[PDB]
């Protein structure tokens, strides 16, 4: 479809219509365009380790994709996984350069263990993103503190 | 316009961001003397209006399907172009084709007399 763009005017949020032209919406500079990463715990999702694990799975045939966000939410619950296959070989890829853990986490749940790895990459079964430092990825990277959330695109007040 | 349909909503937003002011206390802009990776962020709070924050959470939920399909289409690993693309689309909507001064697709207003 089309990536929705949200307009904020006098503390009122409206979704921009791709067909309707609103001349009142003003964009004086690119600094008014912000991408926000809102964490799933804000939506009240279950944050315990056994319940969050059920939201992630392995699948081959889908290459990983990453987007940037400029602002994130302080997360009370973040996760850091070190899952390995029974034979000992690592099950998650080490994070490439530039990808760092979520900047602000209070409780970091160190998830470890050994299980069968059915695929090449760990994806979010509900469609959300694994939010890292200013980068939103579709894939869980080994040993890096992430916080599952989603991304919005806003045009901010002047 | 948005309306929240999520089960719950946290009406207060405690945020972090680097895209903010740097008072530039002398020699702190220099990376050698600059802050470390953990201290490059600023903070803030938007508890003022409960309704706007709950609307943001639904928008971030609703943009997910279109954003995920966007990433399926592109081939590069990391996509920063999205925000610069939205600005180009913004200008192309208003100033893309011929602009009729009093027309509906032209944001031109004649002077006040």
């Amino acid at each position: 479809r089309s990536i929705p763009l949200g307009v904020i005017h006098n503390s009122t949020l409206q979704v921009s219509d791709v067909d309707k032209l609103v001349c009142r919406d003003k964009l004086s500079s690119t600094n008014q365009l912000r991408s926000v990463g809102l964490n799933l715990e804000g939506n009240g999702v279950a944050t315990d380790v056994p319940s969050a694990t059920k939201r992630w799975g392995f699948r081959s045939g889908v290459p990983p994709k990453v987007v940037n966000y400029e602002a994130g939410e302080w997360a009370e619950n973040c996760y850091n996984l070190e899952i390995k296959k029974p034979d000992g070989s690592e099950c998650l890829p080490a994070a490439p350069d530039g990808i760092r853990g979520f900047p602000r986490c209070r409780y970091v749940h160190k998830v470890s263990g050994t299980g069968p790895c059915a695929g090449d990459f760990a994806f979010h079964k509900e469609g959300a993103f694994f939010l890292y430092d200013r980068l939103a990825s579709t894939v869980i990277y080994r040993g890096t503190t992430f916080a599952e959330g989603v991304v919005a695109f806003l045009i901010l007040p002047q | 316009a948005i309306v929240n349909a999520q089960p719950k909503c946290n009406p207060n937003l405690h945020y972090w961001t680097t895209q903010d002011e740097g008072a530039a206390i002398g020699l702190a802009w220099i990376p050698y003397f600059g802050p470390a990776a953990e201290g490059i962020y600023t903070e803030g709070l938007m508890h003022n209006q409960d309704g706007l924050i709950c609307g943001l959470r639904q928008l971030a939920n609703e943009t997910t399907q279109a954003l995920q399909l966007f990433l399926r289409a592109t081939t590069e690993l990391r996509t920063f172009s999205i925000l610069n693309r939205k600005a180009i689309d913004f200008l192309l909507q208003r100033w893309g084709g011929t602009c009729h001064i009093l027309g509906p697709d032209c944001c031109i207003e004649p002077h006040d007399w």
Partner: antibody
Framework: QVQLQESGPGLGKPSETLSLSCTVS????????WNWIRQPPGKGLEWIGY???????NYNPSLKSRVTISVDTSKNQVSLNVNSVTAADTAVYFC??????????????????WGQGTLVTVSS | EIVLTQSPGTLSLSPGERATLSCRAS???????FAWYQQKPGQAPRLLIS???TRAPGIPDRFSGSGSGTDFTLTISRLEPEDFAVYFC?????????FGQGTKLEIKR
């Protein structure tokens, strides 16, 4: 094992400024909201106000003029000052942690942790 | 303006019985983050139920919370002697809390 502890003078001279101090232990003040509740002896609870660790504050509509809440992250304390103190302000004063969720437990902005309460009698 | 009126004011009934405590909102809640508190003598109030229906950790299954937008209700089923306290309803909304009059509950014997 987070514990709150209010501190305040047992007697406050009338028409003066009254100061109480809440001291959080076993948990960092950063990232939570912190309330001030007062309870006149033998009556219901009244919410004085709340304050975030960053500093943004909103107070009770009926008391916003005579009150001012403040936080000090270096001391891990939240302070409360009431000015123009009369005899009605005689009460036990609580501080409470009204948080959206802590760790895996959701509290939905319900106040989970309270202080022990400090009684303040206002008399000449 | 946002005032929470609690009923009944006082109440006394025997162990085993069911106590139903009500609390009406003056204006409709714009954020249903309702809560119920139990205050033992000389103690700070304890959190029984938050978010209209979710029990706080360590609160027995007897305490159950429910609501309908304007009227919210707490039911203490199968009453035991330890439930002697005063119970307050609470409403967080638009960056402010409000409490209720309180319901003083006596356990007969």
């Amino acid at each position: 094992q987070v514990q709150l502890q209010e501190s305040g003078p047992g007697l406050g001279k009338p028409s003066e400024t009254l100061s109480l101090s809440c001291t959080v232990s076993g948990a960092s003040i950063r990232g939570y909201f912190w309330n001030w509740i007062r309870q006149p002896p033998g009556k219901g609870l009244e919410w004085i106000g709340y304050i975030h660790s960053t500093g943004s504050t909103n107070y009770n509509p009926s008391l916003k003029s005579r009150v001012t809440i403040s936080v000090d992250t270096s001391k891990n304390q939240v302070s409360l000052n009431v000015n123009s103190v009369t005899a009605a302000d005689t009460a036990v004063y609580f501080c409470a942690r009204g948080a959206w969720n802590v760790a895996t437990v959701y509290y939905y902005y319900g106040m989970d942790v309270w202080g022990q309460g400090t009684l303040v009698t206002v008399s000449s | 303006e946002i005032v929470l009126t609690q009923s009944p004011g006082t109440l006394s009934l025997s162990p085993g019985e069911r106590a139903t405590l009500s609390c009406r909102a003056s204006q409709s809640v714009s954020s249903s983050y309702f809560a119920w508190y139990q205050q033992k003598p000389g103690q700070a109030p304890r959190l029984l139920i938050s978010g209209t229906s979710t029990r706080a950790p360590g609160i027995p299954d007897r305490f159950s919370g429910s609501g309908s937008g304007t009227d919210f209700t707490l039911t203490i089923s199968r009453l035991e002697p330890e439930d002697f306290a005063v119970y307050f309803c609470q409403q967080y909304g638009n960056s402010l809390y409000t409490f209720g009059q309180g319901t003083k509950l006596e356990i007969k014997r």
